[PDB]
Amino acid sequence: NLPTAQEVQGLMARFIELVDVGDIEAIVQMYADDATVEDPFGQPPIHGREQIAAFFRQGLKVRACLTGPVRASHNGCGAMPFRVEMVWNGQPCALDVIDVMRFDEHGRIQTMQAYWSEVNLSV
Amino acid sequence: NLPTAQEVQGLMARFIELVDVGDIEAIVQMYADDATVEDPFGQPPIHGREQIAAFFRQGLKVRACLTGPVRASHNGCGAMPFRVEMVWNGQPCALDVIDVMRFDEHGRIQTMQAYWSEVNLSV
């Protein structure tokens, strides 16, 4: 069923947990088969689980954690603030991000928009 | 001109500052004359500065502060996490929110979506 506000909080937190551990298959499974991802927002969207899987495999030594509670709505959507820590050619980096997600009637991520730019990056 | 990522950070932070001090006129001036506001997201949108002014006058003993940096994009958009403190019939309340904004070619807020629900509220 369309996720309730409480369920959205759990689903989005789960997403962060999956990125943190780096389970690509589990992350991809959270998305609708034809979901769209805009990360960073403003960039062209990628479509489908294949493109989304390639995207995450490409990006995933990484750590991710919520930096504040997940804000959830009553229409299957939510937004959350988090921090990603990674390594770029042996160099430690950090990025502040906010993901906005819209879930479908099956509890899967239909669309995701990740807000961030170089002003939120530390290399 | 369309706000750069850095300008978006400043504009959105200014918005929070204006809510914190409670300057309704200044807040309203930040919006495009025909801007739309969905607060909380999922609720019907209000349109125009008159409706937006009535909305803020209605809501504004209030304090607001960013709880993390403003995430800004390169296409005039951004998202920010913040906390609002207010009083409901002499009772102190708090609310965690994330505002997503799209600015126009004149640096004004074209659309704003505020994510939050009762799960983010403390009365």
As a dihedral over the C-alpha atoms of residue B23, residue A71, residue A112, residue A19, rounded to 10 degrees, the angle is 130
**B119: nearest CB among A6, A115, A116:** A6
The two three-digit tokens of residue A57, written as one number: 């495999």
The two three-digit tokens of residue A113, written as one number: 């928009």
Tell me which residue of A113, A109, A116, A82 sits closest to A100, measured CA to CA.
A113
Q: Determination method here?
A: X-ray
The two three-digit tokens of residue A116, written as one number: 């961030």
Chain breaks in chain B (C to N over 2.5 A) after: 60
CB contact under 8 A, B42 and A115: no
Q: How many residues does chain B have?
A: 123
User: Which residue of chain A comes nearest to B80, CA vs CA?
Assistant: A98
Tell me which residue of B44, B56, B55, B51 sits closest to B19, measured CA to CA.
B56
Cβ burial of B115 (10 Å; 0-12, 13-18, 19+) is: buried
Mapping DSSP to helix (H, G, I), strand (E, B) and coil, where does residue B46 land?
strand
- Which residues of A fall below an 8 Å CB-CB distance to B? 5-6, 9, 40-42, 67-69, 71-75, 77-81, 96-98, 100, 115-120
CA distances for A90 relative to A86, A87, B68, angstroms: 9, 6, 27
Mapping DSSP to helix (H, G, I), strand (E, B) and coil, where does residue B32 land?
strand
Sole residue written with tokens 């932070």: B13
**CA–CA separation, B42 and B117 (whole Å):** 10
Which distant-in-sequence residues (6+ apart) come within 8 Å of A37 by Cβ?
A31, A45, A46, A47, A51, A52, A55, A111, A112, A114
Letter for the amino acid at B32?
Answer: A
CB contact under 8 A, A81 and B81: yes
Domains, in order of start, for chain A: 1-123 (3.10.450.50)
Peptide bond into B40 cis (omega under 30): yes
Cβ burial of B70 (10 Å; 0-12, 13-18, 19+) is: buried
Sign of CA dihedral B25, B29, B34, B38: negative
**CA–CA separation, B75 and B1 (whole Å):** 11
User: Smallest CA–CA separation between A98 and chain B, in Å?
Assistant: 7
**CA–CA separation, B107 and B32 (whole Å):** 9
Tell me the three-class secondary structure of chain A, residue by residue.
Answer: CCCCHHHHHHHHHHHHHHHHHCCHHHHHHCEEEEEEEECCECECCEEHHHHHHHHHHHHCCEEEEECCCCEECCCCEEEEEEEEEEEECCEEEEEEEEEEEEECCCCCEEEEEEECCHHHEEC
Residue B82's CB is within 10 A of a number of other CB atoms, namely 24
**CA–CA separation, A80 and B84 (whole Å):** 16
The two three-digit tokens of residue B122, written as one number: 């403390």
Q: What is the DSSP secondary structure assignment for residue B2, as one 8-state letter?
A: P
Chain A residues near residue B75 by CB distance under 8 angstroms: 41-42
Tell me which residue of B3, B16, B1, B5 sits closest to B71, measured CA to CA.
B5
Sole residue written with tokens 């789960």: A14
